[PDB]
Amino acid sequence: VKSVLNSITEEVLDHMGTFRSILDQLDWIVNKFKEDSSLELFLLIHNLDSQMLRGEKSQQIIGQLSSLHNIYLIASIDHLNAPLMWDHAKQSLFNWLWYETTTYSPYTEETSYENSSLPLSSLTHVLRSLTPNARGIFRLLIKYQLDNQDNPSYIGLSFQDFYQQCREAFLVNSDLTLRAQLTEFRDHKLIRTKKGTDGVEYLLIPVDNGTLTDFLEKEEE
Amino acid sequence: KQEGTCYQQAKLVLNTAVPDRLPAREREMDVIRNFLREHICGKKAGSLYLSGAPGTGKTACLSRILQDLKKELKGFKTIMLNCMSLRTAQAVFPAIAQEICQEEVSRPAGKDMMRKLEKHMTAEKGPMIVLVLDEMDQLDSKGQDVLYTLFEWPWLSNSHLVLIGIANTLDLTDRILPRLQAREKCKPQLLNFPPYTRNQIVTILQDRLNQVSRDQVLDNAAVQFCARKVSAVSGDVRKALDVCRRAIEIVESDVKSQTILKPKRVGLIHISQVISEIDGNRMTLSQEGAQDSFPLQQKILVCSLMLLIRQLKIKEVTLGKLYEAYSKVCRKQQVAAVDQSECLSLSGLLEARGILGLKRNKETRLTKVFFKIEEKEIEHALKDKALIGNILATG
Amino acid sequence: LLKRTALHGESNSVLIIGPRGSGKTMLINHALKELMEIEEVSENVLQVHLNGLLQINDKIALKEITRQLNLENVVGDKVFGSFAENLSGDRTSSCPVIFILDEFDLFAHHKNQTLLYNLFDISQSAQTPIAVIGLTCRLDILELLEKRVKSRFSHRQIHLMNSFGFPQYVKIFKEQLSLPAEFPDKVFAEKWNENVQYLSEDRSVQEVLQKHFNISKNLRSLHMLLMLALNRVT
Amino acid sequence: RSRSLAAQEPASVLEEARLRLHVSAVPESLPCREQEFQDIYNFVESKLLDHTGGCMYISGVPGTGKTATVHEVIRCLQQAAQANDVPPFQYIEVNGMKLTEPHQVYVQILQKLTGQKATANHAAELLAKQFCTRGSPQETTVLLVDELDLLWTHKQDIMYNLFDWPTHKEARLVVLAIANTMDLPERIMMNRVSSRLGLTRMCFQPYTYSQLQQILRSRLKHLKAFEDDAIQLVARKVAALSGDARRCLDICRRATEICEFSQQKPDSPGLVTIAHSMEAVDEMFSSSYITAIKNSSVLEQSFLRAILAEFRRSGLEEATFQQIYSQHVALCRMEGLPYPTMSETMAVCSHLGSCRLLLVEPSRNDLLLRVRLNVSQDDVLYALKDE
């Protein structure tokens, strides 16, 4: 709501932005269009029902501008819950006039917020610039994850057995050096630690179940 | 001979002072310089995100290419960026707004961004301005709105700006730039840098010492070991130049011992002792009353930690139950009594030398603490036979 | 410990633990008033009256400290600059002032306690050593600080806790009602102390004293038992 | 003579021992450390003759000589500068706790060098363009910072940019990063701070048993007032605790005060006795819990007795306030007192709540008060049966 109200200040009314709260700007723009009877403004707002204005504080701001006949509001509705964003206390100002529209054409613009999956180039370009000893650790936890995935009570491997497996596969040598190798993994949103009740920091990978299954096929070369 | 002359000149070349070396970095540098030649000649402009390796010292690589373009072509101007003194996400655009066209400058008037900065860039009569970007990940916000205007300028009308971002690898295009994998207008370019293994760390040292020194001070067997573990952590150039320079001053200090009062080859044993206090535990030096490890009043408390793990199947304890185990073993052994009024200071005392750790809690006593690693370190190398030998056999 | 600073230049910092302003304020203020009889030091040593109950942060404490010294400003307070040079050959003529704190509980849980670390460095600086004597009700205070402040303390505290009973407790009840020789007539002063002795040994008066002594043996719990009876006397 | 008491000259022996034992009246520094002072001597000397800049980060608890040994490093270099040996330097000092905001460090640096004072942004921008000035000579300055954890911010733009300054061309900054433990760069600080720094972290170990008896001997070289059996006894307890250099001389000062309490007699003893060494341990490490039950009344000791009786047949250390009131009347009626009223239940709790000996939330849930003993449950039984 700040990118629309503050955009008609230094462009339509020619005034720099200096308001305080939200209610301070609402009652300041009404006096500019009430005393003057020659300031028309057409609002060709597209898709009014987006996804970040479902609160009741968003329609009460635009509802005040609808009381004046000098302000024109043109909005589009693309949802079956049209009267869910306004009640009887707001229809007196807007005075909606319904007009059915039949176009039959797909959408190729706003399709971006929907969840696709994750880009495979991120998991591929992260191992090329990674130390050789760290790649063997990432390829070792993925093997024990799919073999124990059938168990519904999978809480993750502990830290004692993880430290023993390192020297069994010629990896890390000490403990403080092993914790330093997990710094670039927790910052890249690959693994995270949880406050376990048994005093053991669990190790899990918050990704999709189908993503780890397609990682062993690209490392065959 | 030239003994004192070689040591006073070796510390200058081994110190981390703008390592602007050309060898050992061929295919990682020619692609960067050739990418800018097509934009200055072909009248093109786009974006270029450089995702460097976390901590490898590549800031001197970009400075070499920028100074070579000044001597080749004369007419363009390059503005630098140093946002290290900007703790907030704002106050970044006005910081670089005072450099319009070198000799032609202006003055700010308060609240005037996104209007005059992008206006002079679209002017075709001006030269090709090159803007440098650094630590772009630290300029994020709650909705990274400040990063939505600097990545769309070389893609709208009049594209006359090349984006060069020098930053290490922390996160790719997931939440910083949501335009990728969603919009088909922007087409950025990504170049990574793998960590330098022994094929580059050993090579970068041959042209570093043999060109400025007269005779080497170490053998060739010590080079293969120092360049082996430095590439296992990250592969930083400063870490490789510091692990070798520090191993020389410890040997040079031993030269002035019953010699000057009235070159040599540094062995491999003199290098392992320097990294001994980095990853190795300092629990061996404890003879002749040398206080280089553990005093006394702390070993009688940490010895009871394993006595509670094998009985409760848990590795976490607290300050409350720690005094209960100490109040029982003191009355049956007649030792020094330590009240719990000063036992909390011992919790903020046993953290160095790579041992147990803890966190911060508001209330006392009830403090969730844990242990680092306990397996086999109390025998062989450590005594624990005549001191706390009767404690482990008691319970 | 007080004579090591006023007569010489050795500052000491101790911790007095007790009840509140009715019991802990019976020894520190009495030692400071003892310095008044000797006028060759009372005129060269001032006193700053601080209270931790009023201060809640750290930025405010950097401005209200100048309201007690008044050596470089006026009713007005100088620039907002946080104090940096707080004036610290071990022999100066700038009149050394001793600071007095109170209630180590409010500012004890602020931000690493950046105010107490300054007072611990002035006595260990190089100019004039300045001591610090405070009051607190909580028992253990030493462990309530970080390791950078724990290793830089005197580790000297006295537990001012009363340990009376019943025979020696009656003397406290009669000492508070023993007014000094200030009455215009000495005849009425003799019957005042004698009437208390007749009521000190009674089957009903001793029962009230032992009932309040078991609940709270602090001297503050007895203050209400001596002023309420005076209101009835008209 | 302006002041009426301009330092009275100690005419005795016990009054003179405090001058050589004071933390401020030190003729030099703490000895028994030549293998470490010589190592840092050749390091700082190699930087002034090279006209470059480096970093330095030590480790150790705040009490091993980090405030006394660093002063002799400057006192020895200033003597050679006057004899045309080493280039001149500038003395810069700054503490991490003297500044409230962690971003005000740019004000003390600009004011120390020149005289202009700005802020954290107006000054922080001039110092960045001054270090990279091409064609301007500088001096081999020294940067001494203390307590690095207070300067840690969320963006990590305080410790990272500070280490990149002496890594330029015309940069002669010698950073003396002083902290506590050595695992700070690999715990609180992240990757960028630990990368541009180096593995040149030489920790300082505490003094040994043979070193504490020598430092105290240098201060008492001509002080015939302490026996040889009492000096080694005080230096023995501190050597087993943590080896702190500040926890040894403070106990000796207490020995100089406990002996004066016996000097009120007409006899004037010379050396100390064996009783002064035993009393210097209990008074130094006093307990704030064994004296609470001894000096208690009758209702206070009976209220704490019923707490352990309810935590025996349940096995849980958490209970309510309504359950503790039921068994409190049983112990009060057996000894010979009437039932306690309800209004006084918060009065006896405010006494223990003021001293915070019983962790409990404030007066919000009077019937749901969480009982949390500050001490254990076995130590209160031995201190109660002593009466």
Swiss-Prot record, chain A:
Q: Which GO terms describe its cellular component?
A: centrosome; chromosome, telomeric region; heterochromatin; inner kinetochore; membrane; nuclear origin of replication recognition complex; nucleoplasm; nucleus
Its Gene Ontology biological processes? Answer: DNA replication initiation; negative regulation of transcription by RNA polymerase II
The answer to whether UniProt assigns keyword Phosphoprotein to this entry is yes
Compartment(s) of residence: Nucleus
Q: Could you tell me the keywords of this UniProt record?
A: DNA replication, Nucleus, Phosphoprotein
Report the domain of life of the source organism: Eukaryota
Would I find Nucleus among this entry's keywords? yes
What would you give as a GO molecular function for this chain, any one?
DNA replication origin binding
Q: Which family does it belong to?
A: Belongs to the ORC2 family.
Functionally, this protein is described as follows: Component of the origin recognition complex (ORC) that binds origins of replication. DNA-binding is ATP-dependent. The specific DNA sequences that define origins of replication have not been identified yet. ORC is required to assemble the pre-replication complex necessary to initiate DNA replication. Binds histone H3 and H4 trimethylation marks H3K9me3, H3K20me3 and H4K27me3. Stabilizes LRWD1, by protecting it from ubiquitin-mediated proteasomal degradation. Also stabilizes ORC3.
Q: Under what name is this protein listed?
A: Origin recognition complex subunit 2
Q: What is the species of this protein?
A: Homo sapiens (Human)
Taxonomic lineage of the native organism: Eukaryota, Metazoa, Chordata, Craniata, Vertebrata
Curated annotation (Swiss-Prot), chain B:
Keyword Nucleotide-binding listed: yes
Query: Could you provide one GO biological process annotation from this protein's UniProt record?
Result: negative regulation of DNA replication
**GO CC aspect terms:** cytoplasm; cytosol; intercellular bridge; mitotic spindle; nucleoplasm; nucleus; spindle midzone; spindle pole
Q: Name one GO molecular function term.
A: DNA replication origin binding
Q: Report the subcellular localization.
A: Nucleus; Cytoplasm
Sites binding ATP sit at G52, A53, P54, G55, T56, G57, K58, T59
Q: Which UniProt keywords apply?
A: ATP-binding, Cell cycle, Cell division, Cytoplasm, Disease variant, DNA replication, Dwarfism, Mitosis, Nucleotide-binding, Nucleus, Phosphoprotein, Ubl conjugation
> How is the polypeptide modified once translated?
Ubiquitinated by the SCF(CCNF) E3 ubiquitin-protein ligase complex.
Main localization is: nucleus
Q: Does the keyword Cell membrane apply?
A: no
Free-text function comment from the UniProt entry: Involved in the initiation of DNA replication. Also participates in checkpoint controls that ensure DNA replication is completed before mitosis is initiated.
Summarize the subunit comment: Interacts with PCNA, ORC1, cyclin-CDK. Interacts with HUWE1. Interacts with ANKRD17. Interacts with GRWD1; origin binding of GRWD1 is dependent on CDC6. Interacts with CDT1; are mutually dependent on one another for loading MCM complexes onto chromatin. Interacts with TTC4. Interacts (via Cy motif) with CCNF; the interaction takes place during G2 and M phase. Interacts with CDH1.
Belongs to which family? Belongs to the CDC6/cdc18 family.
This protein's name: Cell division control protein 6 homolog
Task: Specify the species.
Answer: Homo sapiens (Human)
Curated annotation (Swiss-Prot), chain C:
- Could you name the domain of life of the organism this protein comes from? Eukaryota
Protein name (Swiss-Prot/TrEMBL): Origin recognition complex subunit 4
Instruction: Give the molecular function GO annotations.
Output: ATP binding; ATP hydrolysis activity; DNA replication origin binding; nucleotide binding
- Which parts of the sequence bind ATP? G18, P19, R20, G21, S22, G23, K24, T25
Kindly state the subunit structure of this protein.
Component of ORC, a complex composed of at least 6 subunits: ORC1, ORC2, ORC3, ORC4, ORC5 and ORC6. ORC is regulated in a cell-cycle dependent manner. It is sequentially assembled at the exit from anaphase of mitosis and disassembled as cells enter S phase. Interacts with DBF4. Interacts with POLQ.
The record's subcellular location field reads: Nucleus
Keyword annotations: ATP-binding, Disease variant, DNA replication, DNA-binding, Dwarfism, Methylation, Nucleotide-binding, Nucleus
Query: Which clinical disorder is mentioned?
Result: Meier-Gorlin syndrome 2: A syndrome characterized by bilateral microtia, aplasia/hypoplasia of the patellae, and severe intrauterine and postnatal growth retardation with short stature and poor weight gain. Additional clinical findings include anomalies of cranial sutures, microcephaly, apparently low-set and simple ears, microstomia, full lips, highly arched or cleft palate, micrognathia, genitourinary tract anomalies, and various skeletal anomalies.
A single BP term in Gene Ontology? DNA replication initiation
Which gene does this sequence derive from?
A: ORC4
Q: Which GO terms describe its cellular component?
A: chromosome, telomeric region; cytosol; nuclear origin of replication recognition complex; nucleolus; nucleoplasm; nucleus; origin recognition complex
Q: Belongs to which family?
A: Belongs to the ORC4 family.
From Swiss-Prot, chain D:
Looking at the UniProt entry, the stretches that span the membrane are: none
* Location of the region described as Necessary and sufficient for ORC complex assembly in the Swiss-Prot/TrEMBL record: 27-387
Superkingdom of origin: Eukaryota
Q: How is it modified after translation?
A: Phosphorylated during mitosis.
Q: Which positions does UniProt annotate for ATP binding?
A: V26, G60, V61, P62, G63, T64, G65, K66, T67, A68, E147, N180, R246
Intracellular or extracellular location(s): Nucleus
Q: Which residues carry this modification: Phosphoserine?
A: S4
Q: Where does Mg(2+) bind?
A: D146, E147
Query: Domain comment text?
Result: The BAH domain mediates binding to dimethylated histone H4 'Lys-20' (H4K20me2), which is enriched at replication origins.
Description of how the protein assembles with itself and partners: Component of ORC, a complex composed of at least 6 subunits: ORC1, ORC2, ORC3, ORC4, ORC5 and ORC6. ORC is regulated in a cell-cycle dependent manner. It is sequentially assembled at the exit from anaphase of mitosis and disassembled as cells enter S phase. Interacts with CDC6 and KAT7/HBO1. Interacts with LRWD1 predominantly during the G1 phase and with less affinity during mitosis, when phosphorylated.
Task of the protein = Component of the origin recognition complex (ORC) that binds origins of replication. DNA-binding is ATP-dependent. The DNA sequences that define origins of replication have not been identified yet. ORC is required to assemble the pre-replication complex necessary to initiate DNA replication.
Tell me the protein family, please: Belongs to the ORC1 family.
What is the protein named?
Origin recognition complex subunit 1
Species this protein is from: Homo sapiens
Q: What is the lineage of its organism?
A: Eukaryota, Metazoa, Chordata, Craniata, Vertebrata
